[PDB]
Symmetry: C3
Subunit: 142 residues, 3 copies
């Protein structure tokens, strides 16, 4: 209209322990997220890792916390939960799963996940009596 | 344009959204399940959905269930053209059994915007700056 | 609106679409793998892809494999500029070995629309 600009990923540090999120290349899908504390995760266990950052996502997306590739392939690390709502203003947490047979050590400053700005719709929901058939139909689960 | 649903029995609950800017609509169990430690279950919602054009439906984990109970969501891709019963694949990685009762909120449904590209084979692709190096 | 791919060996299979409005293209194993219980494997497809601009490629789980065999997909983020071999990280949480045969459908690839905002540090979020 009057103003012509690009939306930014806004963040604020909640402590001196946080690291500003980084992007490897100009077209990496995600911003790197860093642990603010030390964690020791035993075999077949989980931990909630605090980043000590609050974020304000641009309109029309949510923030998906996604796994690092190397951590999954080499160490059997996975990311649980992962849905950061557009209107969340709290401390960003990463839920890490250790499926390996050895303990996994997280140190303050380690890169442990990535944040992706996934574009979504926010549709209104409408109940109907019945839906119409497609070629796929009710065919599911292999 | 909208997310349309229909109930497949009286045991279903209409999906809900806590906020106008919440990513997902909450999905509810229509039945009772006990999931033992290190086991999986397929949870019926007893709804069929018609997703808006230009997206798929991602069944995504609730945060509390993940962080406290070590519950995860398997599979999770609901195609735009799917008209069957929406199932939730729950993985229990915790050491105690996880109880699901009718009416419990067990997952969320996100309308993820996607492309539907046409596929083309070529001999070889040109390299960028990331190269072939992955899994770092 | 165009997804380009090339084969890195004779063992690769061209990605297919399961239905007209399927979210993903089927990805196929190029090799034979035995995954023991509670273990992982990196399954090579022997393809390289060029994603359309404005998306990343998400490697996503097959539903039958999850529901029946307790198979899951780890990692899964393919960056727009990646031109290497597409690897699938398969997790076997089941109690029996899982056998992957050359030519088996093991995952799907979804073109997830994203954007690339610049990052801005503020002191308070309402600055
Ligand atoms: O968590 C899920 C995943 C999939 N489906 C349904 C909807 C989807 O459209 C269909 C996929 O079935 P398929 O194409 O026969 O499964 P596969 O990935 O094993 O080829 O199954 C669900 O209800 N819940
Ligand atoms: O991996 C995650 C997942 C979620 N959250 C935060 C952001 C999100 O907006 C909020 C979700 O809280 P909730 O609505 O109480 O979660 P639920 O109802 O799914 O248990 O928690 C995180 O920090 N990390
Ligand atoms: O399931 C996956 C995940 C990633 N990759 C490739 C593509 C992606 O662009 C690259 C990421 O490598 P990295 O940036 O060095 O990984 P990391 O997250 O460990 O920093 O690896 C795959 O082939 N399959
Ligand atoms: Mg998405």
């Amino acid at each position: 209209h009057h103003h012509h600009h690009h939306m930014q990923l806004r963040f604020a540090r909640l402590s001196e322990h946080a690291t500003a999120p980084t992007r490897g290349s100009a077209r990496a899908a995600g911003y790197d997220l860093y642990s603010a504390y030390d964690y020791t995760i035993p075999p077949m266990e989980k931990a909630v890792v605090k980043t000590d950052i609050q974020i304000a996502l641009p309109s029309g997306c949510y923030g998906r916390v996604a796994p690092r590739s190397g951590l999954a392939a080499k160490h059997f690390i996975d990311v649980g939960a992962g849905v950061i709502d557009e209107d969340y203003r709290g401390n960003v947490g990463v839920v890490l799963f250790n499926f390996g047979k050895e303990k996994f050590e997280v140190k303050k400053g380690d890169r442990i996940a990535q944040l992706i700005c996934e574009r979504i719709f926010y549709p209104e929901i409408e109940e109907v009596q019945a839906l119409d058939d497609t070629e796929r139909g009710s065919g599911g689960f292999g």
